């Protein structure tokens, strides 16, 4: 034993998985309840999807807050390993310097 993982309701390992509406009525569970949330200390907690820039991809932008004409960046990260996502910039300096 190493610990306890909260289980999303109606997920493949939730006890309400696969049961018919008669069973859910027997278990005092609404058959129309969509599920997809956890119960933490009796509070129904739902996780919001978080939007972020996609990884491992070349993006050329125009940094106006710098001395660079353009910056090519790429947030590089492995498949489900090394959570630190190493971001690289390859940047063309401004030509206006003189």
């Amino acid at each position: 034993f190493i610990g306890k993982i909260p289980i999303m309701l109606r997920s493949t390992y939730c006890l309400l998985n696969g049961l018919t509406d008669r069973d859910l009525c027997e278990l005092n569970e609404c058959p129309l309840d969509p599920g997809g949330y956890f119960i933490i200390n009796g509070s129904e907690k739902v996780l919001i999807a978080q939007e972020k820039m996609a990884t491992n991809t070349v993006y050329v932008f125009a940094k106006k807050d710098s001395k660079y004409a353009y910056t090519g960046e790429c947030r590089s990260c492995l498949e489900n390993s090394s959570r630190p996502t190493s971001t690289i910039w390859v940047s063309m300096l401004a030509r206006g310097g003189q």
């Binding site: 509406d21 008669r22 009525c25 027997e26 005092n28």
Partner: protein, 65 residues
């Protein structure tokens, strides 16, 4: 929930008609003809049986107390 006793707007009794209205639906009437068969001529009363949702039947699936 359950059918209202009276039509909210006019007060016509529409509580003794929900079960009969479903019985007529089993007899394969149109919804309009079923309501006309029950004498609901004002569309205030027709609103009830046509738009009512009967959730009490669902709540009678759970166990008592």
């Amino acid at each position: 929930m359950i059918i209202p006793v009276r039509c909210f707007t006019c007060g016509k009794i529409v509580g003794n008609k929900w079960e009969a209205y479903l019985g007529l639906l089993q007899a394969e009437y149109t919804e309009g003809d079923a309501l006309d068969a029950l004498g609901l001529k004002r569309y205030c009363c027709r609103r009830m049986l046509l738009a009512h949702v009967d959730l009490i039947e669902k709540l009678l699936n759970y166990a008592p107390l």
